[PDB]
Design a binder for this molecule. Sequence first.
Ligand SMILES: *Cc1c(COP(=O)(O)O)cnc(C)c1O
Ligand SMILES: *Cc1c(COP(=O)(O)O)cnc(C)c1O
Ligand SMILES: *[C@H](*)c1c(COP(=O)(O)O)cnc(C)c1O
Ligand SMILES: *[C@H](*)c1c(COP(=O)(O)O)cnc(C)c1O
Lengths: 463, 466, 466, 463
Amino acid sequence: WSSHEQMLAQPLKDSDAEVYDIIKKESNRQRVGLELIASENFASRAVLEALGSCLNNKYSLGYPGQRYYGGTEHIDELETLCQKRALQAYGLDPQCWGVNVQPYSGSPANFAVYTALVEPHGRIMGLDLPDGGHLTHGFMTDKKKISATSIFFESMAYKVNPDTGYIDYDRLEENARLFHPKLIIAGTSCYSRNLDYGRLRKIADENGAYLMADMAHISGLVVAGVVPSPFEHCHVVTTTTHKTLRGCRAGMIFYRRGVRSEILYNLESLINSAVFPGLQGGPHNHAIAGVAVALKQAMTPEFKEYQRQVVANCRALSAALVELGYKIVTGGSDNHLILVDLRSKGTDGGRAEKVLEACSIACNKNTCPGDKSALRPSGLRLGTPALTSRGLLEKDFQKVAHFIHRGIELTVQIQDDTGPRATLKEFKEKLAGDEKHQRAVRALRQEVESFAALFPLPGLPGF
Amino acid sequence: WSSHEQMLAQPLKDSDAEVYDIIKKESNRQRVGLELIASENFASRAVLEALGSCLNNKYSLGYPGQRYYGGTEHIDELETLCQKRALQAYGLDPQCWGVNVQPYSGSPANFAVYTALVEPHGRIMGLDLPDGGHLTHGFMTDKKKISATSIFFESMAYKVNPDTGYIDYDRLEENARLFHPKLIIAGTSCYSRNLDYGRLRKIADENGAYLMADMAHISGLVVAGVVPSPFEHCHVVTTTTHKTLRGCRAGMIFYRRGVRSVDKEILYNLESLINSAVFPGLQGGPHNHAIAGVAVALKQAMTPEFKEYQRQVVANCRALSAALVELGYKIVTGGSDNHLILVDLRSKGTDGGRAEKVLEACSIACNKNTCPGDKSALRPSGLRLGTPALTSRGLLEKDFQKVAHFIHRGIELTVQIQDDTGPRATLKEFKEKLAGDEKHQRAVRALRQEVESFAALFPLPGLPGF
Amino acid sequence: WSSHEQMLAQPLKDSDAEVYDIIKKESNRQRVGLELIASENFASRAVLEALGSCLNNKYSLGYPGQRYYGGTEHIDELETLCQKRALQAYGLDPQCWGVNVQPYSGSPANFAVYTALVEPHGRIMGLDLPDGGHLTHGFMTDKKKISATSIFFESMAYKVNPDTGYIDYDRLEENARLFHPKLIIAGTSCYSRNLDYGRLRKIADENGAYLMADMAHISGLVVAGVVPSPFEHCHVVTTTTHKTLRGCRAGMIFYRRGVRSVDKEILYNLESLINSAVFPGLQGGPHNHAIAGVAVALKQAMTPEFKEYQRQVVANCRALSAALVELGYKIVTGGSDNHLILVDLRSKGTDGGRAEKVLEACSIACNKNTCPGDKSALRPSGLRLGTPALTSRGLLEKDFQKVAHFIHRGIELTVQIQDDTGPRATLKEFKEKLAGDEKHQRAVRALRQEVESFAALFPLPGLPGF
Amino acid sequence: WSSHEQMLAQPLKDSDAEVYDIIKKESNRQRVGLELIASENFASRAVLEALGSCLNNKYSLGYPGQRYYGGTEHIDELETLCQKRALQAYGLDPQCWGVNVQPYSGSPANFAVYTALVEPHGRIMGLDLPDGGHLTHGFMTDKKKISATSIFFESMAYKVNPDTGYIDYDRLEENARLFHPKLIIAGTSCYSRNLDYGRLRKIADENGAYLMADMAHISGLVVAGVVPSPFEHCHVVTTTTHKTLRGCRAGMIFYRRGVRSEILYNLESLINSAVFPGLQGGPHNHAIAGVAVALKQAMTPEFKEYQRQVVANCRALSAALVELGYKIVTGGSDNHLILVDLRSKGTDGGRAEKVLEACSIACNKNTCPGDKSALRPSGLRLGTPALTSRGLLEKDFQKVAHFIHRGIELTVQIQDDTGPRATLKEFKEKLAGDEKHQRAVRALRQEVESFAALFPLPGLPGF
Ligand SMILES: *Cc1c(COP(=O)(O)O)cnc(C)c1O
Ligand SMILES: *Cc1c(COP(=O)(O)O)cnc(C)c1O
Ligand SMILES: *[C@H](*)c1c(COP(=O)(O)O)cnc(C)c1O
Ligand SMILES: *[C@H](*)c1c(COP(=O)(O)O)cnc(C)c1O
């Protein structure tokens, strides 16, 4: 047809006004808000351009040199290039390390590794969820298995010491001798400290287990050399490509090659087989191009500088909050985030996140090591990656600290009008249903959005 | 250091010349070639524009109803809109059907359903791979379990009758009574005929099993009303959004809501089990930019232009099959009801394994596939051919007849090379003969030229030559 | 307190009058009844004497080779002797066959083999229960797994052809290619014909599976050479020691040793895997008194008298079947090659469910069983009849013809009662009609008298009326 | 035939001379030896008579009131009677407790319970093997699963404190919150102390798990009221019928009936279904008769007296050994056995058991809580049930203590001639290959066998 020939060439603005409008409103919402959620960032224009390329059309099952279909000359150049930049970015010798770049995301990357090295019902140990662990590391209760990791495998968590906020390696070492894990996971979603990879490797070798690092949250810090690298002691390293690496959504699996002890590593073929034809079908080539572009950007001195600023910003933010009387779990941080214990102010993350949200300050609740209840998490997780990508510096994060402080005070107030004992649903009602309050929110929001508009919003020119 | 901000705003062309160059060469490769691989298509510009939006930066966990974090006012509008268009596009009453739009792709969508309704080691039955089934429907040998479906669940396949090329429903009905499946899969990767959903539903109900349709390959034909809908008898329907639906890569899970049976009645519990399996079960944050792309593709799929596109797709397949029959080729089941056909090359004394390589060198893309008969997977007898991609470029019946002759020229050439390599020669040797033999290499070059010239006559959908 | 020692030396008759009385009544019940249940027999006095020996007090763990504790000089002589007699009795070369004699019973013997060669969730194929298979070969429905074999492993049955009553090897061969079993079971609980071990071995080798024979029902016939031996084609053979072997309750596992295949050759690893599964895998200390009983039964089974007993067993079954055919009864497969027959009572308008109850009240023991046809398990059409027990009491062909008429009288009576209860009457009601109805109760009493008088004419093997 | 008619009536002595001879030699070996293996005993004549009855011929699938075959009038009387005596013997109200008497032995009884309440891959926790646990409670290494319990289910052990020799309940309570067991096992094969059932029940209820007691070793002590009963806090109790109960080999499963909390107990049908048709076929009726006879004997005042003597004998034996300078794990015992730590004499159980065996003194090696190696167990497990059934009293066990002591000295000697460092195979050679030694053995053996012949050997008149 003559009209069908152009339906395929019509711009989004004309083709789908409704979706186009939603993107515009979301673009604007991101501009006037303060993003403190530790897992978010702003991808560069170049990365986003690669996502909408014609690579979306190429279907290519398999791997370079092992393709099911033909016509993959350029797709091979792409994937090969992506793998080369991944090893390079982390300073890895291709004779000792290899990498798979097809995982659709972080969760799928972890699952493929378990499938490959652990097998159904094999034992896996990971940091407990309320102590800062991730769902894919295992999540189950006494009556039900929630995470797919816990459903298809046998997981058992290890905890942090509630008095220090640090991972209790001694207890882990002891429990591992009884549990007999086939794989131990070193990775976190809400832990402000570096992990003792060396100690974990010793514990893993003691039980004949593999040591897998999930560096999703610190992958960017690692490339820049701002926090120790897990590649020195781990057998496998998984990671997402967004978060601190600042790329598009996707995942990667790094695995050791060569001699293990003369015993040789068999990780490569097991992992590759698990990703495909095991768990996935055709790879998302447009996403692989986006990652390639993100990895090149991550190797620039500018990126290195960005990462140093990220950590500096976190330090300034934590210091400013301590000065305002806030308690930081473990007293501080070594990376991009901090867990703030709000008990030091008589409130909780559950109520605080809602008030701050209404004020255009995004962050999320999280349980603190102590916490005797998950229905009333004591802390707030705060991260600096996103705002640092917008150019905020130390002086800016001190102002951010005051805005957050204003928020906490407000959440406390809506709490003093409700009485020391009241449900979360009563609190939210008194929040949006009170002259002085919905009015307190409106005022703080205005100051927050004005301050936020002073900074550039990375991405495509203008949606 | 100051150039860090100038780094996040820099265009791809300046930021990464190497990747930019690869995209250009791939864009050009797609333009001068003839795409006959049944699972490929060309996504519209609008869809691709949605993929590179700022939706990439939004991390949301959970569903529109209950999210983990805040600031999802617009993400909720998006996902909700996407779900509404999905039900609408397939003519489904939201009181009887619901839909999850977060699966990252087709394989993940199927796996989430198994995880939800079957549970570890539960029994699943699907069409055998060499008979046209998909990996995610189960794949194992007597010594090893390859597909994740076969590793975490207990799968057993059902076959097609090798004499008719059709699915043997009688044998399936019998074997199901002994196997006791908890779920039966109705879906194919290389089957040219409609599926008897009604018959499969009866067999499923007989064993108390769920009937799941994987309509990935025909999802576009279904929307246009060109082939019967699986929503009439199935409990669950999974699908990819690319392939015939012509969207970006992603997956969707449709499930029934309301009353299942009586006596006094019992309700469907598919919704919460499936939603829980997708998240927090198997996935983390949804890819919102991909959900926007799907939304855009679903709106385009409801237009009369799309419906006309789908009619042309089937008409093209019919013309292509007729033209090949006229040239003496054997088509499994003798023909097709949809977008593809499986060509049995034994009728010409060669096989798909060698033919696909020669055709590839001539810029004609397609893939080998075993035929129902075939007593060996190392020497598949057929070639799977699809019309979706080329129809999106505007080819009509007369164009597919010309395509048929180009393919025929290719087969003749591969036969010439096969006779030159020997009898017990290996594919490895066949490919080397095709690579370093000026004689054949000259035949290839000539045919390639004609194929690429003919292909340049048609527009390549997408962005402005990117 | 001083009478404690006088307590450990006191005879059962004085020590426990109540138990002693029960044994007396049971001994008498066995004497005046006609035992036609195919799985029963009467163990010799010698065997029973070994069971009550001081071997009961010896706790030994491990095997003759390597034990956990000491003081096993004689226990080693015993187990070693038992293994030697087992191989000998079946004419097996110890260089090609080995045997484990610790299983506590038949079910445990099978389970240990599955545990050793299959592993959790491994695939196993066995004869379907309603077609004559045993529980330990797999038993599950579409909603629940009943047998431990079906709970810990993945089982799928194969069936007999309902028109011929024979095992459909063709369908099994086909289904095995799709199911991929790791082990196939050749053994039955209610099948009157010989098994085609050769054919099953070919099918097993085709799928790389092990072939395991469960010869529990025919172990005695095999020793005597009255039916073909499964040791010619199987990799493993399990069996109970009671039933036709006429020993005490226990089980044994025979496994091949040496070279399995070539190319350069590979060895059998069955021995250590099986031994490890029995102990320390599934069992603790072996029952030595039971191992002594088996040893004694194996020596008796190698005598010419035993061989003659086994020939009489088969001849009796043939006469019993012929006599029933003459009375108009239908026998599945038309006859038998061994010790039993499945009688299809549809040929008389009744079913095994009601017939077994009436016959029981007349002191004629047998059990119901579904026939290949049967469209319902709640109304089994047949009766399984065996001759081992009565042949051990000396009945000959002319005696089994009289037995046939008594059974016939029973069937006529159950038909009379069925017509009196109604059409859609329940078994519950059928049993109540048979219980509180002087008319039928008078018919029962009369037939019972004739049956018990005829049965008292024969000796009851075992101890002196105990 | 006329000769076949009598092959079945011929006595064992004439029918099978070879087997008959073996029984005679074994009967004699039992008479002249000193049985100190804690799991052995001598069954009464009455019990043995029931085993060789005509009950061996009756095939009866199912349970009373639920039979597959007919002609079970007396078999029903038997099983019913056996169940009634089992409940009675332990003072259980049939409205609150039920019992299955078909398990062929102890291991099968445990396995059926796991099959019924845990299901494939369900989690189970039991006392670690080297700390006194039993195989059926779980046994696996970092590379292989040995016990069927560990192969079909997911097991993890709990340990004893190596400094006190007692079960560390605190650590168990902590690990259970991470492991999430569906069932916890309270039972031992080599533990001289009573178990804190109350504490274990609290831990089980805390994780929603079932508490199962395996009282195999103390079932006789329990009936007599010499050690606390596990029926006060457990949901299920399994046991063998030999060992201290002094019956034939068989097993039983006791389970609670009635209201659990209005939630009702579902143990009965699950357990019955698992035993049959789940795991077993026809029950061994002759063994059920033997158990019935053993249960009646266990309820007599004479049996009660026997059990008091058993414990008194153990106390005297332990005191006499302490006086000779031997170390007893946990310092003593509350029951029929003791674990002797031979490190206090510079030798190990591995070597000592062999020397004592050569001297006609039966016992077995066992690791001590400390032990940094299973290939060189430090202790010897000694039990008094068997010898007490032969009439030994306190004064007799003091003499037994000296004989054992003489044995230890000899094992040490063969050890001083071999040098502080030598393999177990060299030691055994120097034992049987030395004039003074094989001569030392012969002498002690003579004294041991003479002393042993002074006591009656329970059982059948004379084989
Ligand atoms: C966020 C996060 C994930 C989830 O990533 P997805 O790409 O959303 O699937 C996985 N692992 C860790 C350690 C994380 O922080
Ligand atoms: C000895 C013992 C067993 C083993 O009994 P078997 O009857 O040999 O199978 C099981 N459990 C415990 C606690 C034991 O002491
Ligand atoms: C292609 C295809 C798939 C796989 O989809 P992916 O999106 O590539 O992961 C699944 N099912 C069917 C029926 C297909 O044709
Ligand atoms: C009877 C029978 C069994 C069961 O034996 P048990 O000793 O009763 O436990 C197993 N297999 C077959 C083939 C049988 O006939």
